[PDB]
Design a binder for this molecule. Structure first.
Ligand SMILES: O=C(O)[C@H]1O[C@H](O[C@@H]2[C@H](O)[C@@H](O)[C@@H](O[C@@H]3[C@H](O)[C@@H](O)[C@@H](O)O[C@@H]3C(=O)O)O[C@@H]2C(=O)O)[C@H](O)[C@@H](O)[C@H]1O
Length: 404
């Protein structure tokens, strides 16, 4: 008898397929039981952090790429998957993708899929507005006035949570200036004080121009998951800047026959880089101190490589990196080039994207600080100037703690 625990996050579609994969795995291995621990994204890292701090984390965990510095600065924070290569077919995964999940020579997770935030739009609402999807940053900014006037005050081209906004304005700044956002060598942000003023001024411009809800307006609804909010469901918030790897969590909640459709990616004339936040979407990792590394490795291999596991899991985590899995799903007609998640990935790959985001750009305290910052602007407690200086100062402080 081997008892394993596995955690993951996601929407209920992902919960469904994962649970069904676990029953097959157990059917194939009567001596191995897996206790499933799953939630939505909200608070998931917080809960795992508490487990790891106390040494009680699961045997198998779905993990995020920005968590590697948080838990595994020296690469020993998760079990070294090179040590279980007998059970786990590593050759299915591109070596450059494995490099992204390797730390000090130790393989900390198997990357499941890749992803980038891109624009997806509610086709029903945009048709009502009579507008085509923005092809430029100018058209995005201009869409807000059209939505507000043609459809009504409650209508917005997109909705953006603060993390989405942080990535979006970074993309714009990368297009303009072609420099990394984080200066990893000097453990600090790379932007001049002027560029930070520009960053927050763009936010203010977008809010003023009715592109997306302000934080104050968003709060007036304001606590469920974004994809479960009424103005999302009914099409009033007509788009999202979101991972292709989890786009059905969003599209599944729209009101038929509305669909989420892939939009253009705005590119500044003369930009050398799109400034995508492009990364491994998520990983499967093994607990550092698991008493069952081999059985844990068997479970990962089953989910990511086995015919039954791949079939069960389908596309709920995006387009598989595993060569056998992605071939299988194309062959079964599950992967369709016209599907917004697949099309979104293909568009992103063709965009010039040589700049790779630092994992510290997605440090959760940096992301939280950003939310506080824009809230200061929207609630009239700091000017754009004061907010920029505050973000630069407090962010550099967080980065120093994060990168120690
Ligand atoms: O495919 C995935 O599950 C995805 O998970 C991570 O992204 C999380 C979250 O799961 C995403 O839905 C998205 O979350 C939304 C907002 O962007 C976020 O700021 C927060 O408000 O919650 C929203 C939500 O719950 O849907 O973005 C999240 C994030 O980027 O942290 C991984 O990061 C991602 O790569 C992928 O595995």
């Amino acid at each position: 008898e081997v008892n394993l625990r596995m955690s993951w996050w996601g929407g209920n579609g992902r919960h469904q397929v994962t649970l069904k994969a676990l029953e097959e795995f157990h059917k194939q291995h009567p001596n191995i039981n897996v206790k499933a621990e799953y939630t939505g994204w909200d608070g998931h890292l917080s809960r795992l952090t508490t487990q790891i701090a106390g040494g009680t984390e699961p045997d198998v965990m779905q993990t995020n790429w920005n968590w590697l510095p948080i838990f595994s600065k020296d690469g020993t924070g998760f079990y070294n998957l090179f040590s279980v290569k007998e059970q786990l077919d590593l050759a299915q995964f591109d070596p450059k993708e494995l490099q992204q999940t390797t730390v000090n020579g130790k393989l900390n997770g198997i990357p499941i899929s890749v992803t980038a935030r891109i624009f997806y739009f509610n086709d029903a609402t945009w048709a009502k507005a009579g507008l085509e999807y923005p092809k430029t940053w100018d058209e995005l900014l201009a869409a807000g006035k059209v939505f507000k006037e043609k459809l009504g005050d409650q209508y917005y081209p997109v909705v953006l949570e603060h993390q989405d906004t942080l990535a979006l304005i970074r993309s714009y700044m990368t297009q303009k200036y072609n420099i990394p956002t984080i200066d990893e060598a000097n453990k600090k942000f790379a932007y001049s004080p002027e560029q930070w003023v520009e960053f927050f001024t763009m936010y203010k411009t977008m809010v003023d121009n009715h592109v997306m809800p302000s934080t104050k307006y968003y709060a007036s609804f304001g606590k469920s998951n974004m994809y479960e909010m009424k103005p999302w469901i009914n099409g009033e918030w007509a788009g999202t800047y979101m991972w292709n790897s989890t786009i059905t969590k969003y599209s599944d909640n729209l009101t038929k026959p509305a669909k989420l459709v892939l939009g253009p990616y705005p590119m500044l004339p003369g930009a050398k880089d799109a400034g995508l936040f492009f990364k491994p979407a998520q990983m499967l990792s093994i607990g550092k101190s698991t008493k069952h590394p081999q059985e844990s490795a068997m479970l990962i291999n089953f989910l990511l490589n086995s015919k039954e596991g791949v079939e069960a899991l389908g596309l709920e985590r995006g387009v598989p990196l595993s060569a056998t899995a992605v071939t299988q799903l194309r062959a079964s007609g599950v992967i369709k080039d016209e599907d917004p998640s697949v099309a979104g990935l293909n568009m992103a790959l063709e965009l010039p994207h040589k700049m790779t985001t630092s994992p510290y750009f997605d440090d959760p305290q940096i992301v939280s600080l950003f939310g506080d910052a824009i809230q200061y602007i929207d609630y009239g407690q700091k000017t754009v100037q004061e907010t920029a200086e505050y973000f630069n100062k407090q962010g550099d402080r967080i980065l120093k703690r994060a990168m120690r």
